[PDB]
Design a protein around this motif. Structure first.
Motif, mmCIF file in Angstrom:
data_model
loop_
_atom_site.group_PDB
_atom_site.id
_atom_site.type_symbol
_atom_site.label_atom_id
_atom_site.label_comp_id
_atom_site.label_asym_id
_atom_site.label_seq_id
_atom_site.Cartn_x
_atom_site.Cartn_y
_atom_site.Cartn_z
ATOM 1 N N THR A 1 0.860 -1.175 0.000
ATOM 2 C CA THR A 1 0.000 0.000 0.000
ATOM 3 C C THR A 1 0.904 1.234 0.000
ATOM 4 O O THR A 1 1.393 1.658 1.045
ATOM 5 C CB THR A 1 -0.929 0.009 1.227
ATOM 6 O OG1 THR A 1 -1.695 -1.204 1.257
ATOM 7 C CG2 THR A 1 -1.879 1.206 1.192
ATOM 8 N N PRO A 2 1.148 1.807 -1.182
ATOM 9 C CA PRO A 2 2.107 2.918 -1.216
ATOM 10 C C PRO A 2 1.687 4.131 -0.388
ATOM 11 O O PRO A 2 2.559 4.824 0.121
ATOM 12 C CB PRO A 2 2.219 3.270 -2.702
ATOM 13 C CG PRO A 2 1.105 2.565 -3.387
ATOM 14 C CD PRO A 2 0.699 1.404 -2.524
ATOM 15 N N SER A 3 0.388 4.356 -0.221
ATOM 16 C CA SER A 3 -0.079 5.513 0.537
ATOM 17 C C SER A 3 0.318 5.420 2.016
ATOM 18 O O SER A 3 0.317 6.426 2.716
ATOM 19 C CB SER A 3 -1.595 5.673 0.407
ATOM 20 O OG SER A 3 -2.283 4.603 1.035
ATOM 21 N N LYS A 4 0.659 4.219 2.484
ATOM 22 C CA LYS A 4 1.085 4.025 3.869
ATOM 23 C C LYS A 4 2.602 4.081 4.032
ATOM 24 O O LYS A 4 3.114 3.916 5.133
ATOM 25 C CB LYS A 4 0.552 2.701 4.416
ATOM 26 C CG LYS A 4 -0.962 2.690 4.551
ATOM 27 C CD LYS A 4 -1.454 1.430 5.238
ATOM 28 N N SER A 5 3.318 4.334 2.944
ATOM 29 C CA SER A 5 4.768 4.422 2.980
ATOM 30 C C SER A 5 5.216 5.863 2.794
ATOM 31 O O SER A 5 4.931 6.483 1.770
ATOM 32 C CB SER A 5 5.375 3.579 1.870
ATOM 33 O OG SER A 5 6.770 3.801 1.822
ATOM 34 N N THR A 6 5.942 6.385 3.777
ATOM 35 C CA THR A 6 6.345 7.791 3.757
ATOM 36 C C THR A 6 7.440 8.057 2.735
ATOM 37 O O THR A 6 7.701 9.208 2.376
ATOM 38 C CB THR A 6 6.815 8.258 5.140
ATOM 39 O OG1 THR A 6 7.888 7.434 5.601
ATOM 40 C CG2 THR A 6 5.665 8.188 6.123
ATOM 41 N N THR A 7 8.062 6.988 2.247
ATOM 42 C CA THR A 7 9.122 7.098 1.252
ATOM 43 C C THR A 7 8.661 6.769 -0.176
ATOM 44 O O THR A 7 9.441 6.885 -1.116
ATOM 45 C CB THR A 7 10.318 6.212 1.633
ATOM 46 O OG1 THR A 7 9.852 4.949 2.119
ATOM 47 C CG2 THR A 7 11.150 6.874 2.715
ATOM 48 N N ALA A 8 7.410 6.351 -0.346
ATOM 49 C CA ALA A 8 6.889 6.055 -1.681
ATOM 50 C C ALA A 8 6.649 7.333 -2.471
ATOM 51 O O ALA A 8 6.136 8.308 -1.940
ATOM 52 C CB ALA A 8 5.594 5.271 -1.576
ATOM 53 N N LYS A 9 7.019 7.312 -3.743
ATOM 54 C CA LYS A 9 6.716 8.405 -4.651
ATOM 55 C C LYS A 9 6.241 7.831 -5.981
ATOM 56 O O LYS A 9 6.865 6.934 -6.550
ATOM 57 C CB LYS A 9 7.950 9.273 -4.882
ATOM 58 C CG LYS A 9 7.655 10.543 -5.660
ATOM 59 N N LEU A 10 5.109 8.323 -6.467
ATOM 60 C CA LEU A 10 4.606 7.908 -7.766
ATOM 61 C C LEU A 10 5.618 8.313 -8.824
ATOM 62 O O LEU A 10 6.093 9.437 -8.827
ATOM 63 C CB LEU A 10 3.260 8.562 -8.067
ATOM 64 C CG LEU A 10 2.654 8.207 -9.429
ATOM 65 C CD1 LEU A 10 2.156 6.781 -9.407
ATOM 66 C CD2 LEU A 10 1.534 9.166 -9.803
ATOM 67 N N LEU A 11 5.960 7.387 -9.708
ATOM 68 C CA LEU A 11 6.830 7.699 -10.827
ATOM 69 C C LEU A 11 5.905 8.156 -11.939
ATOM 70 O O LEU A 11 5.255 7.351 -12.612
ATOM 71 C CB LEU A 11 7.668 6.487 -11.234
ATOM 72 C CG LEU A 11 8.686 6.744 -12.344
ATOM 73 C CD1 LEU A 11 9.761 7.747 -11.897
ATOM 74 C CD2 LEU A 11 9.317 5.437 -12.765
ATOM 75 N N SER A 12 5.841 9.468 -12.113
ATOM 76 C CA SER A 12 4.800 10.070 -12.922
ATOM 77 C C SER A 12 4.826 9.577 -14.359
ATOM 78 O O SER A 12 5.850 9.653 -15.034
ATOM 79 C CB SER A 12 4.948 11.580 -12.894
ATOM 80 O OG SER A 12 3.972 12.180 -13.704
ATOM 81 N N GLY A 13 3.675 9.107 -14.822
ATOM 82 C CA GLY A 13 3.505 8.687 -16.198
ATOM 83 C C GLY A 13 4.002 7.301 -16.541
ATOM 84 O O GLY A 13 3.810 6.843 -17.660
ATOM 85 N N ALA A 14 4.629 6.628 -15.581
ATOM 86 C CA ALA A 14 5.233 5.318 -15.840
ATOM 87 C C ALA A 14 4.218 4.187 -15.708
ATOM 88 O O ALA A 14 3.427 4.127 -14.763
ATOM 89 C CB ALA A 14 6.418 5.091 -14.922
ATOM 90 N N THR A 15 4.235 3.295 -16.687
ATOM 91 C CA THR A 15 3.411 2.091 -16.633
ATOM 92 C C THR A 15 4.286 0.894 -16.969
ATOM 93 O O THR A 15 5.401 1.038 -17.460
ATOM 94 C CB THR A 15 2.229 2.160 -17.624
ATOM 95 O OG1 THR A 15 2.720 2.334 -18.960
ATOM 96 C CG2 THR A 15 1.271 3.300 -17.274
ATOM 97 N N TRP A 16 3.764 -0.295 -16.713
ATOM 98 C CA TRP A 16 4.485 -1.517 -17.014
ATOM 99 C C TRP A 16 3.481 -2.591 -17.386
ATOM 100 O O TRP A 16 2.311 -2.522 -17.017
ATOM 101 C CB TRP A 16 5.325 -1.956 -15.816
ATOM 102 C CG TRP A 16 4.505 -2.285 -14.608
ATOM 103 C CD1 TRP A 16 3.988 -1.406 -13.704
ATOM 104 C CD2 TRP A 16 4.086 -3.587 -14.183
ATOM 105 N NE1 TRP A 16 3.280 -2.075 -12.742
ATOM 106 C CE2 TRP A 16 3.343 -3.422 -12.999
ATOM 107 C CE3 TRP A 16 4.303 -4.881 -14.671
ATOM 108 C CZ2 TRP A 16 2.789 -4.507 -12.309
ATOM 109 C CZ3 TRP A 16 3.755 -5.955 -13.982
ATOM 110 C CH2 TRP A 16 3.012 -5.762 -12.818
ATOM 111 N N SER A 17 3.954 -3.575 -18.137
ATOM 112 C CA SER A 17 3.120 -4.675 -18.598
ATOM 113 C C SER A 17 4.040 -5.801 -19.033
ATOM 114 O O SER A 17 4.931 -5.599 -19.863
ATOM 115 C CB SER A 17 2.249 -4.231 -19.766
ATOM 116 O OG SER A 17 1.453 -5.309 -20.224
#
Length: 330
Positions: free
Chosen positions: A60-76
């Motif tokens: 759950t990234p919202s519960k991690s103070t060090t998580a940052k969204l990598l803007s625009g990045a996707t994977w498949s």
């Protein structure tokens, strides 16, 4: 620096192995499948389609103070067994057995295929092939090993998988107590992004060694040993009643059989896979037909030294400027 973590079979057949991984702050521990045949670190998450989560531990990234969204990045990603997953990407702190990488790309699954959902024991994958295979777009990301490498005492990791037992992944050092004899090193091609090498041949049971070059990949994320049809036929011909079954999808054998060992060459050295390692049990509950652990690579397009082979050895993944692979008996 170094790290050392225990890896544990997910079931009684050693179908795969899981290793605990700490992600985020405070740590969220997920059990990941360390996969030297791919290059994405992806996890079940709070973003995963709810109907596709069935017992896994989620990040759950919202519960991690060090998580940052990598803007625009996707994977498949799609794997050789037909499974797949996809989503978006965070960077966060990831630790394995005491070794910490900051800013690691943690690929958060929005979708996973049924085989992942159905396996409650695997919370995601940690890829250990070359970063050129990483699927993040539009900016490809580095593997955990690639990120850790410069900080490691030595730019290596080792796989010591157990037969029906726990084993160890080490980063940054070679545990000289974990193997017998010497480690034989052999050349690697990174041209396809894999730990690709050439075995020098094989033997079946107590039979004579056949010198023949077999190009293939060291792949901890594949369960079985996939080899050319000629080699596989020679193996199963030594098991009374064994046959290739199109309905089952490979070689099967009477569960009453005693399986011969299989030896593969690493340079002038030899790794012996005991017969019992090649038994994957009844094809369906209660059946007396058992599934073989050595199967044809025909139509995969590549030979794969999966867990059946690797667990017979102590394996060094040497990520020096010119990578190499080392194998020792143990």
């Amino acid at each position: 620096s170094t790290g050392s973590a225990t890896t544990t079979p997910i079931d009684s057949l050693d179908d795969a192995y899981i290793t605990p991984v700490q992600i985020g702050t405070p740590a969220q521990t997920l059990n990941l499948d360390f996969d030297t045949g791919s290059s994405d670190l992806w996890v079940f998450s709070s973003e995963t389609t709810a109907s596709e989560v069935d017992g896994q531990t989620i990040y759950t990234p919202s519960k991690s103070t060090t998580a940052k969204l990598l803007s625009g990045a996707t994977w498949s990603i799609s794997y050789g067994d037909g499974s797949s997953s996809s989503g978006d990407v965070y960077t966060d702190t990831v630790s394995v057995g005491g070794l910490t990488v900051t800013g690691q790309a943690v690929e958060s699954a929005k979708k996973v295929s049924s085989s992942f959902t159905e396996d409650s024991t695997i919370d995601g994958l940690l890829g250990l092939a070359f970063s050129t295979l990483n699927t993040v777009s539009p900016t490809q990301q580095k593997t955990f090993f690639d990120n850790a490498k410069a900080s490691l005492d030595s730019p290596v990791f080792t796989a010591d998988l157990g037969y029906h037992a726990p084993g160890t992944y080490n980063f940054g050092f070679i545990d000289t107590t974990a193997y017998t004899g010497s480690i034989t090193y052999t050349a690697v091609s990174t041209k396809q992004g894999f730990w690709e090498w050439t075995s020098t041949g094989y033997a079946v049971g107590s039979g004579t060694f056949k010198s023949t070059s077999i190009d293939g990949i060291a792949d901890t994320g594949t369960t079985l040993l996939y080899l050319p049809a000629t080699v596989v036929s020679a193996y199963w011909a030594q098991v009374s009643g064994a046959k290739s079954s199109s309905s089952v999808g490979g070689y099967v054998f009477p569960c009453s059989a005693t399986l011969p060992s299989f030896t593969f060459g690493v340079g002038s050295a030899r790794i012996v896979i005991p017969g019992d390692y090649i038994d994957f049990g009844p094809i369906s509950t209660g059946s007396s037909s058992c599934f073989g652990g050595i199967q044809s690579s025909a139509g995969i397009g590549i030979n794969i030294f999966g867990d059946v082979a690797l667990k017979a050895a102590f394996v060094v993944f040497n990520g020096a400027t010119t990578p190499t692979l080392g194998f020792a008996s143990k």
